[PDB]
Design a protein around this ligand. Structure first.
Ligand SMILES: Cc1cc2nc3c(=O)[nH]c(=O)nc-3n(C[C@H](O)[C@H](O)[C@H](O)COP(=O)(O)OP(=O)(O)OC[C@H]3O[C@@H](n4cnc5c(N)ncnc54)[C@H](O)[C@@H]3O)c2cc1C
Ligand SMILES: Cc1cc2nc3c(=O)[nH]c(=O)nc-3n(C[C@H](O)[C@H](O)[C@H](O)COP(=O)(O)OP(=O)(O)OC[C@H]3O[C@@H](n4cnc5c(N)ncnc54)[C@H](O)[C@@H]3O)c2cc1C
Lengths: 113, 119
């Protein structure tokens, strides 16, 4: 109330945009040549994320997606592409335009100049 | 800042800075705490600890992550219930608030901010 303005909990939409920001940013700072431990932790991270993501149907669907499309974690390029395709699967459901994954790296890593 | 090549809705938005990444990631972390069970299973407890451990390794801000890793080491995540995990998350966020000279959030209002609203 006092120190901070009263703000309502995020809706599914706000949770989503916040969460893609984290997901794509995690991929953008993943190594080009990850260690075995980094590969395993990334797979584990995404598996648990799919269990705990705080939208029921979002999480359930994402778990099924991972089961059917194993995360590609051999390099940042692969993981970034995997994340882009995963995000595009959701865009397709929600009747959002397909994002061109050739721009994933500019959008989430390098910027536009 | 106009539309990216070949698109009609996606603008050339810059990668998030430390601030934008930060408020997005707090949104996810507190929201994770808010939908954690009152009575979690052993698997849920174990995965929550693993998730936060891995998060502390991979959080894309280097110094943010190293500090968070150290914070976890010194203040073990309290995962026996939603109430405990919310409070732990509020205290963790408050330690970063402290570092950054932002006000202390009164953790008694964590559930209203991240779960119940203010009606
Ligand atoms: C794992 C997950 C599952 C979800 N499932 C659902 C669901 O089932 N139903 C539902 O209603 N909501 C779901 N959400 C939320 C949904 O995807 C959106 O995040 C939310 O609706 C907000 O949409 P938005 O239009 O603001 O842009 P968002 O889709 O959140 O995207 C934000 C920005 O990401 C960039 N971007 C867009 N597409 C890509 C891409 N393919 N690759 C890289 N960058 C891209 C663009 O710059 C865009 O502006 C889910 C979210 C997550 C993280
Ligand atoms: C794990 C982690 C570590 C970070 N470490 C650093 C760092 O070392 N240095 C750095 O510059 N940035 C760091 N960041 C980012 C920083 O915490 C902020 O997110 C960023 O500066 C933007 O601040 P903000 O004013 O927009 O509000 P945020 O601090 O991002 O908070 C967003 C909202 O959360 C609510 N809130 C505030 N405090 C609490 C609380 N204690 N409990 C529950 N809800 C609360 C308020 O309503 C607030 O408006 C870190 C982020 C994370 C997620």
């Amino acid at each position: 109330s006092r120190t901070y303005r009263k703000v309502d909990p995020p809706d599914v939409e706000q949770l989503g945009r916040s969460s893609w920001t984290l997901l794509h940013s995690v991929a953008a700072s993943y190594p080009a040549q990850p260690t075995d431990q980094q590969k395993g932790e990334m797979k584990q991270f995404l598996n648990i994320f799919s269990h705990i993501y705080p939208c029921n149907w979002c999480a359930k669907d994402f778990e099924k997606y991972i089961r059917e499309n194993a995360p590609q974690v051999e390099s940042r390029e692969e993981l970034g592409r995997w994340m882009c395709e995963a995000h595009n699967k959701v865009n397709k459901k929600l009747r959002k335009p397909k994002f061109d994954c050739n721009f994933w790296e500019k959008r989430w890593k390098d910027g536009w100049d």
